[PDB]
């Protein structure tokens, strides 16, 4: 697993690139993959910069923090831009949770550095909402 | 819902106080609550400083980010110190996720300020592992 600040932020940046792609460049296909008729689905960002919509981990507790569950159950009950912003904030929170899971053994100064690297990139919520 | 840095940190501190109590002062009670034979359980910390072990939210996606699922399924598969540290890191991550869910509309500098308040406190992982 990523252990140094550099390794953890490299992982973060790649997962963020994946989710940014899902919510912008690939948003039409991402939207269509969140089929309300399917079982509960999650949006994953992977460290190879790919995004995936799939069922949650079969076995629990999972190795990594899990993304928000059942986003496809919320899709048709909201306007599209509001659903996308909801997915975006939950995705921002998941990215932060994953990084600080890997960063459990970082010291106070290293945690500050890791957050400063994350915080200097626009959040998915700010990108999607145009803030 | 908490909106300002100060409101979000007040909320964070109350949930963290609850989780810290579950993992230290109340650890025997919390350990017993996480019965491996029950259905999958989560550990919550609430803004009134109560902690709770219960099933996850029945309806998804939940209003707030969810804690790690099924921590009772890991209890008897590892040493007590390692299980408590596992719960602690996931709880640290949940606390961060909830705070920056509330803080989605904060700007960059206010998000940084919120993390500086959070990062002045020892993490639950730090406390439980004796760092």
């Amino acid at each position: 697993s990523p252990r140094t600040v550099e390794e953890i932020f490299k992982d973060y940046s790649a997962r963020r690139a994946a989710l940014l792609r899902a919510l912008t460049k690939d948003v039409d296909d991402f939207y269509s993959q969140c089929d309300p008729e399917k079982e509960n689905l999650c949006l994953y960002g992977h460290p190879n910069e790919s995004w995936e919509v799939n069922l949650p981990a079969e076995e629990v507790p999972p190795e990594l923090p899990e993304p928000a569950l059942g986003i496809n159950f919320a899709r048709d009950g909201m306007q599209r831009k509001d659903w996308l912003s909801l997915v975006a904030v939950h995705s921002d929170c998941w990215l932060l949770s994953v990084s600080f899971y890997f960063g459990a053994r970082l010291n106070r100064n290293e945690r500050k550095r890791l957050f400063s690297l994350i915080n200097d990139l626009p959040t998915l919520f700010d990108v999607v909402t145009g803030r | 819902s908490p909106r300002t840095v100060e409101e979000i940190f007040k909320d964070y501190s109350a949930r963290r106080a609850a989780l810290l109590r579950a993992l230290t002062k109340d650890v025997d009670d919390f350990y017993s609550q996480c019965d491996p034979e029950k259905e999958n359980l989560c550990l919550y910390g609430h803004p009134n400083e109560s902690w709770e072990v219960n099933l996850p939210a029945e309806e998804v996606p939940p209003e707030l980010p969810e804690p790690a699922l099924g921590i009772n399924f890991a209890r008897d598969g590892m040493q007590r110190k390692d299980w408590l540290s596992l719960v602690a890191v996931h709880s640290d991550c949940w606390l961060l996720s909830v705070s920056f869910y509330f803080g989605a509309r904060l700007n960059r500098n206010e998000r940084k300020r919120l993390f500086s308040l959070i990062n002045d406190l020892p993490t639950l992982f730090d406390v439980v592992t004796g760092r």
Binding site: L55, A74, G77 | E58
Partner: peptide
Amino acid sequence: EVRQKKRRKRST
């Protein structure tokens, strides 16, 4: 307007 459900019971 029509308001569909925005949550549903988890699939399990």
